Amino acid sequence: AVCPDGTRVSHAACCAFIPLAQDLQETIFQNECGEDAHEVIRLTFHDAIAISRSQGPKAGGGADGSMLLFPTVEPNFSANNGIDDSVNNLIPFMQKHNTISAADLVQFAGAVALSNCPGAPRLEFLAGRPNKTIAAVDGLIPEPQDSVTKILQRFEDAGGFTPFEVVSLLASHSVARADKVDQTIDAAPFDSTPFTFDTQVFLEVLLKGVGFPGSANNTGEVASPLPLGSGSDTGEMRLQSDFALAHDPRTACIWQGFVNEQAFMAASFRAAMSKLAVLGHNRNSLIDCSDVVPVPKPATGQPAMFPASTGPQDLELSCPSERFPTLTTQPGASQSLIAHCPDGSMSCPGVQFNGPA
Ligand code: HEM
Ligand SMILES: *[C@@H]1O[C@H](CO)[C@@H](O[C@@H]2O[C@H](CO)[C@@H](O)[C@H](O)[C@H]2NC(C)=O)[C@H](O)[C@H]1NC(C)=O
Ligand SMILES: *[C@H]1O[C@H](CO)[C@@H](O)[C@H](O)[C@@H]1O
Ligand SMILES: [Ca+2]
Ligand SMILES: [Ca+2]
Numbered sequence: 001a002v003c004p005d006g007t008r009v010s011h012a013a014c015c016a017f018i019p020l021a022q023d024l025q026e027t028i029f030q031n032e033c034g035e036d037a038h039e040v041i042r043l044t045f046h047d048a049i050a051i052s053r054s055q056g057p058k059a060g061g062g063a064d065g066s067m068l069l070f071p072t073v074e075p076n077f078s079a080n081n082g083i084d085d086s087v088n089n090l091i092p093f094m095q096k097h098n099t100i101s102a103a104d105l106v107q108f109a110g111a112v113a114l115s116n117c118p119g120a121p122r123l124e125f126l127a128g129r130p131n132k133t134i135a136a137v138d139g140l141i142p143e144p145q146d147s148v149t150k151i152l153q154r155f156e157d158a159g160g161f162t163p164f165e166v167v168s169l170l171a172s173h174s175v176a177r178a179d180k181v182d183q184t185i186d187a188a189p190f191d192s193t194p195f196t197f198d199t200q201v202f203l204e205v206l207l208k209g210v211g212f213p214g215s216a217n218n219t220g221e222v223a224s225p226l227p228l229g230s231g232s233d234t235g236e237m238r239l240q241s242d243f244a245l246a247h248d249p250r251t252a253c254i255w256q257g258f259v260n261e262q263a264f265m266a267a268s269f270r271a272a273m274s275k276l277a278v279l280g281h282n283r284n285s286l287i288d289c290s291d292v293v294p295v296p297k298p299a300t301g302q303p304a305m306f307p308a309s310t311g312p313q314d315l316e317l318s319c320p321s322e323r324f325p326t327l328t329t330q331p332g333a334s335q336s337l338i339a340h341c342p343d344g345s346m347s348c349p350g351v352q353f354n355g356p357a
């Protein structure tokens, strides 16, 4: 097909996604792997994972747009605290780009956001999910205080995911920060490169924790190896769940195996997101519009490194059968701040629409 803009595409049904990508990039992402991109990637997961094989379809329809179509229901569950921002940012696109379902908009917006993060893969994108569903029930979203047994079970019940696929999906914590876990600080990053889809989070969760970026008493949080912050440049936060996954025998070797293995991490993430993005649907009934996902920013290709103030003596290793890689350490004895903004500054407020969630 040839779309009104002159673009040649796979199928005519894919055409409408071209001006939607352009509008998302101009209006809320600005081609950056920034705050609003991060919040939309988190929403792709919270929309898709609310589905249960054991409870049946009444519990939820998966990647179905339920967060946008029932904005006063799931976004107010305690485990979804903070998801209101992404929902209120995407509802105006649903109203305007009104030949694309809420469910397709959520998954496609996630693919466009991740393409702004250097090193990310170009996700598969299948289209055609219906625009009608139900609100999901509470209790289906994993939380940072949960055990590994509880987390792996939730992912098995949602879509048959293996432990390898679960840790693969957690490469998204390479481009992720926390606003609600600690009520005294905003935008606490999970690795020292929250604007780059690299393997640093896998390395940095394996370092010994030495302090906290904010208070020492929040549910779901454990000590961080890089807790220093100043002004808006908040220090690194460590979730109990990532820590527990990095040390549990079921997942410790998979966690370590992504350290300094960028192409392996990105291809494994692509494969598991291919499964997550179609929860609630038969993939044989969705059309392939992968050709309209933007081409992702490339990485520089540099190896993973220990950040200044850390080194191999700080590692807490848990995988007996695989050799930890040889990595260099950045010079300096004291911690470097983790910038609040992609261009290195401290000041870069993102667009936020008000809305019903
Ligand atoms: C056991 C699994 C998981 C748990 C318990 C978990 C937990 C969390 C927590 C507590 C936050 C901080 C939210 C806040 O306070 O603002 C967060 C942020 C984030 N999560 Fe996860 N998550 C998990 C899986 C996933 C997966 C599978 C993805 C996507 C493929 C994902 C993508 C993100 C993103 C991108 C953010 C950053 C949001 C931002 O910076 O604005 N998470 N996660
Ligand atoms: C999917 O459902 C949503 C919600 O019902 C539809 O959104 C409405 O869209 C029209 C324009 O087409 C707006 O005037 C309304 O205000 C929107 N409703 C709400 C509650 O926001 C959307 O049009 C549907 N999309 C498709 C592809 O059928
Ligand atoms: C980042 O900043 C720290 C000091 O905060 C240095 O030690 C490091 O070398 C880098 O310049
Ligand atoms: Ca959903
Ligand atoms: Ca990173």
Ligand SMILES: [Mn+2]
Pocket: 035, 038, 039, 177, 178, 179, 187
């Ligand atoms: Mn956020």
